[PDB]
From a paper:
To determine how DH475 binds Env, we determined a 2.90Å crystal structure of DH475 with a Man9 glycan, and it revealed a heavy chain paratope. This paratope was dominated by contacts from a 27FAVNN31 motif on CDRH1, a 102TAWW105 motif on CDRH3, and residues N74, G75, and D77 on FW3. The S54 backbone on CDRH2 also participates in this interaction. On CDRH1, N30 and N31 both form hydrogen bonds with mannose moieties of the pentasaccharide core of Man9, and N30 forms an additional hydrogen bond with mannose B on the Man9 D3 arm. W104 on CDRH3 forms a hydrophobic stacking interaction with the core N-acetyl glucosamine, while D77 on FW3 forms two hydrogen bonds with mannose C on the Man9 D1 arm. While the D1 and D3 arms of Man9 interact with the DH475 heavy chain, the D2 arm is distal to the binding interface. Wild-type DH475 bound to the CH848 TF gp120 core with a KD of 4.0µM, and mutation of the paratope residues eliminated binding affinity (KD>50µM), confirming the physiological relevance of the DH475-Man9 crystal structure. Superposition onto five of the published structures identified a binding mode in which DH475 may bind an open Env gp120 but clashes with the V1V2 loops of a closed gp120, consistent with co-elution data showing DH475 formed a stable complex with an open Env trimer or gp120 monomer, but not a closed Env trimer. We observed reduced binding to DH475 by the mutant (KD=14µM compared to 4µM for the wild-type core). DH475 binds a glycan-dependent epitope on an open or shed Env that has already bound CD4 and/or a co-receptor and its binding site spans the V3 loop and the base of the V4 loop.
Towards this goal, we have analyzed two cooperating antibodies, DH475 and DH272, which exerted pressure on the HIV population in an infected donor, called CH848, to evolve in such a way that it became sensitive to the V3-glycan supersite DH270 bnAb lineage. Cooperating antibody lineages exert evolutionary pressure on HIV, forcing the virus to develop escape mutations in such a way that makes it more sensitive to a bnAb lineage. Donor CH848 developed the DH270 bnAb lineage, which targets this epitope, and DH270 lineage development relied on cooperating lineages DH272 and DH475. DH272 and DH475 were able to neutralize autologous virions isolated during the first year of infection, but then lost potency due to mutations in Env.
Author numbering:
A (entry chain H): 1 to 227
B (entry chain L): 1 to 214
Write the structure that this text describes.
Amino acid sequence: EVQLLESGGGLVQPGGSLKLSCAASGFAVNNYPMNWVRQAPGKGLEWVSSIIGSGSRASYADSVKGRFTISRDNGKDIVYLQMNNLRADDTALYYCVKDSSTAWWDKPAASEFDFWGQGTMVTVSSASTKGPSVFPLAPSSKSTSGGTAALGCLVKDYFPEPVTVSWNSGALTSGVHTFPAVLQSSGLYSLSSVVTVPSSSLGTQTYICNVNHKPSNTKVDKRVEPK
Amino acid sequence: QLVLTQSPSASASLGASVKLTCTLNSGNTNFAVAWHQQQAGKGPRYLMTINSDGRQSRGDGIPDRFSGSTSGADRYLTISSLHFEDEGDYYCQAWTADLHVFGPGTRVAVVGQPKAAPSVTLFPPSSEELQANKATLVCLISDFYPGAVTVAWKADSSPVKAGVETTTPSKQSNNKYAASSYLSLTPEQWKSHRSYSCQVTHEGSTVEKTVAPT
């Protein structure tokens, strides 16, 4: 039940600052040094910073030295990463990872990473947020009862990534497929989520999609009507 | 100083062996490395740690078809029996108590596996978007293998390139691939043409979905 729960990611301006938090549980956390590893969207893993269990010693990569600051609170077992003077090259998914080996108290240490968090996404761009528009992708007029009809929801023009989509408040997971978003030439994202349903179920069951864009506090529930 | 290099992309038949290399530089030939597997669209997980003398430390939960070997300054991760679970990017990690270093990343993918055709869905603009003086056509391609597809758009019979935004394919839950294409246009353009079409080409097969203003 080892868990590293990271938070604090979001949209920040080139030159701004941001404080990441990692809630670590399931093991004696101060027995182990903690780390931060980042990954650009289409690139490889890069170590960022590390802090030993006592919290008195720390290590940074040359590309973030003096700019970032790793911290640690052992009364609450939360690892922090304070990022100042951010810039485009820092936009990434940041992982909080755990060293496998313990060591002597207050002395330097490092080993292989044995567990990774799911990451928190920081997006450093001068562009601002925008809540998406939502539209129903209705079943086609060619939907004969006794078959499959495809319906869905189009979430258009949102920044930044991502949007979470559920159907009928989560009660419909069968045959749902949410697509990875396209990045339009205007800089804004767009995706759509589609579920295929029995054709004769149209008119008997109402289908509602629930989209959530946390970066703009936009919850939208749109019902998809046959036409 | 510490820098390790990795092997080019790997390719093996389903269930055949594959062997990836992580090479330490001069002066650090005695170092230990760890391997981490990032399957498509997920976070990395720790695989195993191999070191110069021969020891292997594995992570609980990993299948036992992963093993590690050492030759001088050369650390290998071998996958006997290559599965679809095993596809993805593998990175190697080295450490010196003052820093960490990762590898360029090596990708593992099966080869020679059966060819799977795509299913295409075309959605015309919603009346809500039309009322909003906007029009987007949504082409959704899914359940195809391999992940290499080419998309074209057509107004009536003539091809169209202005307004096309097509994504790159990505793995989905069932180890097949999916992509989408969005055609932006004015509602006047939408209402003026007889039909609009999304044409999807994959492994020679060219299929097409067509919608029309109602």
